[PDB]
Amino acid sequence: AQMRVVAFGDQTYDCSEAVSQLLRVRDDAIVVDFLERAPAVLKAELARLSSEQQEETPRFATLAELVPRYRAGTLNPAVSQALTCIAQLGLFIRQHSSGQEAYPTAHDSCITGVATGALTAVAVGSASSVTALVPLALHTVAVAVRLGARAWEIGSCLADARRGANGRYASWTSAVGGISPQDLQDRISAYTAEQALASVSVPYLSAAVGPGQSSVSAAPVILDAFLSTLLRPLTTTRLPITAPYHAPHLFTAKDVQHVTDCLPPSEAWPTVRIPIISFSRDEAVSRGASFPAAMSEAVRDCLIRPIALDRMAVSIANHARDLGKDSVLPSPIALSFSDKLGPQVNSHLPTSKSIPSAIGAEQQPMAKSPIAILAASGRFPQSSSMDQFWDVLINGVDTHELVPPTRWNAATHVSEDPKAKNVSGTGFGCWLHEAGEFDAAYFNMSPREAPQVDPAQRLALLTATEALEQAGVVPNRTSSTQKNRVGVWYGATSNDWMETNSAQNVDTYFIPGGNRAFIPGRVNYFHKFSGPSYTIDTACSSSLAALHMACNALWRGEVDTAIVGGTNVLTNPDMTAGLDAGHFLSRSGNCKTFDDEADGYCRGEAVVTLILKRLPDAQADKDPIQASILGIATNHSAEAASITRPHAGAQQDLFQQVLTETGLTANDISVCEMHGTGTQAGDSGETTSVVETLAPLNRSGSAVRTTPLYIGAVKSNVGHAESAAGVSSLAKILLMLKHSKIPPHVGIKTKLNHRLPDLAARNTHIARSEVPWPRPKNGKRRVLLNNFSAAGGNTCLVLEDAPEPEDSQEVDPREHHIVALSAKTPDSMVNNLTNMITWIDKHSGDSLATLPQLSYTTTARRVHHRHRAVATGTDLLQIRSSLQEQLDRRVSGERSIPHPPNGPSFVLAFTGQGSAFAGMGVDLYKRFASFRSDIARYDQICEGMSLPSIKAMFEDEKVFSTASPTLQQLTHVCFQMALYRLWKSLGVQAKAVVGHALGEYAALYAAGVLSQSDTLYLVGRRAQLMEKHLSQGTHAMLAVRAKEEAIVAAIDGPPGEAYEFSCRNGEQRNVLGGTVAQIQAAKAALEAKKIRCQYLDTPMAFHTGQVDPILPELLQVAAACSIQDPQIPVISPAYGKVIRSAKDFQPEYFTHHCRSSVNMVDALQSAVEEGLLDKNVIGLEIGPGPVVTQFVKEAVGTTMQTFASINKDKDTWQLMTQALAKFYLAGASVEWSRYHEDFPGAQKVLELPAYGWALKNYWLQYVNDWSLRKGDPAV
């Protein structure tokens, strides 16, 4: 008997943190859809207004850029009103969709609101769902802006803007305390009488709060004058109410009517179903009123009637009593001093947990989500990898140097005083000396084609590929990695390759090799990604602009995975001569950021590709996550003097724009990666914007910051990468996060820039030497990043630490593991082997979980090419020893030939029930899933057919002792079909099948003749027939090592009278059956001639005259089957022949089979004579023991490879890993994701060496300095 009250606030509550934490919401689609939508209905009603509103109308790109001007007081009443309303609705829409909180209903809840909250309250009371709240909620946004707008009309009319305002808008309202509302009203009246003031300009009591508290509104000049007359002990405190409200003398009914004219007339408007507590009226409760009428009435509360906040508490309580509720929950939304409400309402009157959901549901949706950065690879100056870049930064390395001769000759292109045309004042740069290296074979390029391709394209392909492997991305492996859900976006400032290098001789691959669009395109073509492809040029912000587009794609659901990168490689001296002509470039050296003498930026080269994914998909696929991007934003510096220099106002508004969109405050960002281009103006301007955003000073003068800020610029090291500048900065932070250190700042060579503000006073710092920067316990480190452009587009993002990696305590019980290596060239294979050995030597003793996670990583998360190598062992040392030996053989001249496209050929051998044993197949049954399903299936199916239950045979070993013939027989057949399903699932497709006796029934399923369950009906019914008619022990079977001729000559009596041949297995291997007396006599006759003879455990004598009575009924049950043509040939011992047609599987087959001898020799010879079997075929025993493979082996040759699935002696996974190794090397497609699926401890992505590239230098030399003579004749 509890009643929750939803209470909304007024302008006094600061919604900057509110709105901030709203655009953090990624946990529901209706929140972001509504919040994004709010500007639309808003702007739809923003245009019908007066002219003065069009004068001082601030700029706002989204609901974010309003925040800094809100805190600064430079935001008007119309928009600040709408902003508060949006924030209130957003928090509600959050809490009731994101927050899994039920929607208000008239029985258990009521609504209340103060000023803006009243408008908000109408909307919540009028809907039956959040989804139904959305449109009404927007109509309320339009009402809110027209409310604040009209208030500013009349308020501007009463008094205009003050001279000392400087854009800040003064507050029309003030809170008074220490006096009763009535006594203060008397003081107002007295002041009115004593001073000469108009009837409209008079002060008035705007609100009644408490016994000693209230609020008074007048003019900033008038209100100041009145408040100056109120002396201590009374209190006076300011409030952000920027227009006159609650003034029945200033406003009338026409103003209310007008504010609500944005609501079209209709009869379908929903009514107010939840009672709203309107406490400032005669009627405390109002329900059932239509939405427009309710809105106009709420507008009248705001504009006309005074707030009576002393009547709010009891007003709620009265209604609580009306419905017979003992107490209330407060649920305040953006309500000033909300904490004290609950006690106040309960004074008049006489426990939560989250609801989990499906795996991936309790978290946020897959539409919008804090995008995780999975991996990043790149090539940077003096760095072939991200790790060498960390070495550049942490050691304070400065990489600038004169242009190398590979690009152009500085002696002719550089002079201290450029005079001649196309000559520059600088030749400095931070260069990629390896940019020509590339592997043409990996990417299917001819040595003719690979030179003509831009280094941006080629290194984009390399870095992209590497980033994919680092993230363990296999196309079409998971939902997020499906080929049509993957996008690419790359920033590029110029293609100098086609302007300078390939331009000397144009050919067919000139345009494929030179246009910027192929940079992302080529990546999509190689990996077969059918998602979007784009190149972005915002100049020096290009990469972050591309990142922004990519983040938007993941945010709108356009792609699951996004590939983001940037490329800068400069082969063209003109770009130097022109940028230098524009005074952009430093003629002394690198970017010196913050240095008191900074003359420009130094060009640099970089190539980066990253992998981005929605966090739901990221965590779902167990991908690595180095960090997570909360958000990002872009504006343009329109207010600039010049096209050249972006200015600080736009930049600051953009910093708070991302702090809103992301949802944090200054104190949360502990480090800022600035876009420092080594300019006195740029550096001072940007620093001022950064500290004013992230390190403010209160009005008293102290620092707002509780923790330290550390500011730096990557450009002071590797120079200015232009398009790739943003990704370089981002690259820096990904490593800084990894190693938990801030590298030194080398930009200050001589003296700090004197134009900067005092950094120490605001707790900004420039780390000169490395500083410990550890992760707060149960917290996350957060960073602000920048990259800007001369083209004025400014872009920045906020980056946050990755989630906490879950601690998997389940240890892999598997003893033996398998490691899979692959490559496209023998050299590349040698490289990968060497690099893997060195990696094992690094991590040899770290942990035991390393080997399962290595197998999972190297297998399920890797693409597998034609050259392949494998190692298998119980610990990392065995793996190393194997890879080392095989590496030694490759270095010694062993040729690596790729396997054929078809792969190895297979014949599957199914054994009879003779060699079956207790606890057969139990380990696979315990640990695996699909096999368990197969067995459980056979159990429910057999229980449905009135056959015994087989599940107990694999659950428990004891039951094998007392098992009946039918149970053992069904268990055997079920075992073979489930086993065959497993091997079929692992990628082994059979060329033909051969069974022996009972194994052929599984062969009929494997061939496609019979279904599984039907096979169990036939076999089971047959066993019941054998138990029904025959008797155990009367007959027996004998295994004999000798030829048929010798056996016949040895036994007195012909075959078919004194005995019968049950099986003809091999040349000298035969089996005899008959009555016990016949077997005894035959055994003596054979032993007399020293022929080795041994008995079978078979109680009956199969394939002899014994089974005559069961054949008629077995014929009917053989007609019970539905027969189909075999999909592959069936080697039939029954008829001694290879059958391809269903005509021979007619019901007579199963009778013939039961009675007739099993001729393996005749069937196998028939198979080899057809060419179906030869030495190159690989036999695989599906069954308890290798009795049949030895017969096949005898038939075709001694060198045939045969491998058995199950054997009593050894451990199952040794056989498994060892078996998979041969097929994977000989070629096959094995599903590795399922091999590790039931072992979560093994599922993690290790950082392993990148693919060993077979690299060659592909380059077209720029020669003869022809760029200096542009426009001149030949001469």
Q: Which stretch binds a copy of itself (CB under 8 A): 160-168, 180-188, 378-386, 602-610?
A: 160-168
Establish if 1264 lies at the interface with a copy of itself (CB under 8 A).
Answer: no
Residue whose CB is less far from a copy of itself, 281 or 477: 477
Residue 1146 makes contact with a copy of itself by CB under 8 A: no
Asked whether 1016 and 975 are in contact (CB, 8 A), the reply is: no
Q: Which stretch binds a copy of itself (CB under 8 A): 177-185, 510-518, 629-637, 1123-1131?
A: 1123-1131
Site stretch for a copy of itself (CB under 8 A), options 307-315, 423-431, 741-749, 944-952: 944-952
Of 540, 602, 672, 1154, which one is the catalytic site residue?
540
- Which of 482, 886, 905, 1165 touches a copy of itself by CB under 8 A? 482
Q: How far apart are CA 725 and CA 678, in angstroms?
A: 14
Active site residue 739: no
Applying CB under 8 A, the span of 301-309, 440-448, 817-825, 942-950 interacting with a copy of itself comes to 942-950
Residue that has been written with the tokens 């590797």 in this structure? 718
952 binds a copy of itself (CB under 8 A): no
* 60 touches a copy of itself (CB under 8 A): yes
- Nearer to a copy of itself by Cβ, of 256 and 854: the residue is 256
State which H helix or E strand residue 191 sits in.
helix 181-194
Q: Judging by DSSP bridges, how do beta strands 771-772 and 741-742 pair with one another?
A: antiparallel
CB 242, CB 76: distance < 8 Å: yes
Candidates 166-174, 279-287, 422-430, 863-871; binding stretch for a copy of itself (CB under 8 A) = 166-174
Q: Does position 276 bind a copy of itself by CB under 8 A?
A: no
Burial environment of residue 347 by CB neighbours within 10 A (0 to 12, 13 to 18, 19 or more)? exposed
In angstroms, the CA 690 to CA 652 distance is 7
Smallest distance from a copy of itself to CB 619, Å: 15
Q: Are strands 867-873 and 1069-1075 parallel, antiparallel or unpaired?
A: unpaired
1111 binds a copy of itself per the rule CB under 8 A = no
Under the binding rule (CB under 8 A), the answer on residue 649 touching a copy of itself is no
Sequence-separated (6 or more) residues with CB below 8 Å from residue 1119: 1147
Q: Which helix (H) or strand (E) holds 815?
A: none
Using CB under 8 A as the binding criterion, the count of chain residues that bind a copy of itself stands at 122
| Residues in 907-936 that interact with a copy of itself by CB under 8 A | 930, 933, 936
Verify whether residue 675 is a known catalytic residue.
yes
**Which of 168, 159, 141 minimizes the C-alpha distance to 217?**
159
User: Considering just the CA atoms, what is the radius of gyration of the chain in Å?
Assistant: 41
Q: Does 237 bind a copy of itself (CB under 8 A)?
A: no
CB 4 within 8 A of CB 108: yes
Please state the length of the chain: 1275
Known catalytic residue: 816?
no
361 CB-near residues (< 8 Å, 6+ apart): none
Closer residue to a copy of itself, CB minimum distance, 860 or 1082: 860
Q: Applying CB under 8 A, which part among 67-75, 426-434, 695-703, 900-908 lies near a copy of itself? A: 67-75
Closer by beta carbon to a copy of itself, 791 or else 945: 945
With CB under 8 A as the contact rule, the residue among 504, 1034, 1080, 1127 that binds a copy of itself is 1127
Q: What sign for the dihedral angle of Cα 844, 846, 849, 854? A: negative
Q: How far is the CB of 1145 from a copy of itself (least distance, A)?
A: 13
Over the window 957 to 986, marking each residue x when it contacts a copy of itself by CB under 8 A and - when it does not, the resulting string is: ------------------------x--xx-
User: Considering beta carbons, is residue 810 or 1125 the nearer one to a copy of itself?
Assistant: 1125
Residue 1116 interacting with a copy of itself (CB under 8 A): yes
Helix (H, G, I), strand (E, B) or coil at 1215: helix
Binding mask 288-327 for a copy of itself (x = CB under 8 A): ----------------------------------------
* Letter string b/e over residues 758-781, b meaning 16 or more CB atoms within 10 A of that residue's CB: ebeebbbbbbeeeeebeeeeeeeb
1088 contributes a contact to a copy of itself by CB under 8 A: no
Which residue from 232, 340, 353, 895 is in contact with a copy of itself, where contact means CB under 8 A? Answer: 353
Please tell me whether residue 149 binds a copy of itself under the rule CB under 8 A.
yes
Q: Which of 476, 552, 740, 1264 binds a copy of itself (CB under 8 A)?
A: 476
For a copy of itself, the closer of residues 34 and 390 by Cβ is 34
Q: Indicate the pairing of strand 109-113 with strand 2-8.
A: parallel
Considering only residues 142, 796, 979, 1040, which one is a binding residue for a copy of itself as defined by CB under 8 A?
Answer: 142
How far is it, in rounded angstroms, from Cα 154 to Cα 770? Answer: 59
Convert residues 75-94 into a mask of x (bound to a copy of itself by CB under 8 A) and - (unbound): xxxxxxxx-xx---------
b/e burial code for range 1059-1091 (CB count within 10 A of at least 16 → b): bbbbbbbbeebbbbbbbeebbebbbebbeeeeb
For residue 497, give every residue at least 6 positions away whose Cβ sits within 8 Å of its Cβ, in sequence order, or none: 453, 454, 455, 456, 513, 514, 569, 571
Shortest distance (Å) from residue 856 CB to a copy of itself: 16
Shortest gap between Cβ of 1129 and a copy of itself (angstroms)? 16
Q: Hey, what are 463's tokens?
A: 């870095």
- Which segments of 1055-1200 does DSSP mark as H helices, in order? 1076-1088, 1111-1119, 1148-1155, 1160-1169, 1188-1196
Phi then psi for residue 1214, to 5 deg, are -60, -50
Segment 1000 to 1019, residues that bind a copy of itself, using CB under 8 A: 1008, 1011-1014, 1016-1018
Minimum distance from residue 127 beta carbon to a copy of itself (Å): 16
Where on the phi/psi map is residue 698: left (φ > 0), alpha (ψ -120 to 50), or beta? beta
Q: Calculate ∠ Cα 856-857-861, nearest 5°.
A: 100
Residue choice 3, 127, 138, 144 for contact with a copy of itself (CB under 8 A): 144
Match 């707030």 to its residue by tokens: 307
Out of 356, 772, 779, 1171, the only residue in the binding site for a copy of itself (CB under 8 A) is: 356
Cα dihedral angle (819, 820, 825, 829), rounded to 10 degrees? Answer: 0
10 Å Cβ neighbour count for 305? Answer: 15
Smallest distance from the beta carbon of 702 to a copy of itself, in angstroms?
Answer: 48
Q: Which of 319, 400, 720, 996 is catalytic?
A: 720
Say which of 319, 527, 675, 996 is annotated catalytic: 675
Residue from 359, 897, 1088, 1274 in contact with a copy of itself (CB under 8 A): 359
Within residues 509-538, the interface with a copy of itself by CB under 8 A covers none
The reply on whether position 617 binds a copy of itself by CB under 8 A is no
* 164 contacts a copy of itself (rule: CB under 8 A): no
How far CA 439 is from CA of 358, 448, 1231, 1249, 1256, in Å, comes to: 45, 13, 29, 17, 6
- DSSP class of 1252: P
Q: Output 1092 or 1143, the one with its CB closest to a copy of itself.
A: 1143
Interface pattern 196-225 for a copy of itself (x via CB under 8 A): xxxxxx-----------------x-xx---
Q: Which of the ranges 279-287, 406-414, 431-439, 1119-1127 carries the binding residues for a copy of itself, by CB under 8 A? A: 1119-1127
The answer to whether residue 268 forms part of the interface with a copy of itself (CB under 8 A) is yes
In eight-state DSSP terms, residue 776 is: P
Per CB under 8 A, which of residues 1055..1074 are in contact with a copy of itself? none
Instruction: Give the residue, chosen from 133, 141, 207, 250, that forms a contact with a copy of itself under the rule CB under 8 A.
Output: 250
State the pairing for strand pair 606-613/561-568. Answer: antiparallel
Q: Which of 40, 43, 44, 160 binds a copy of itself (CB under 8 A)?
A: 160
Min separation Cβ 184 and a copy of itself, Å: 20
Phi, psi of 1235 (to 5 degrees): -65, -35
Residues labelled catalytic: 540, 675, 720
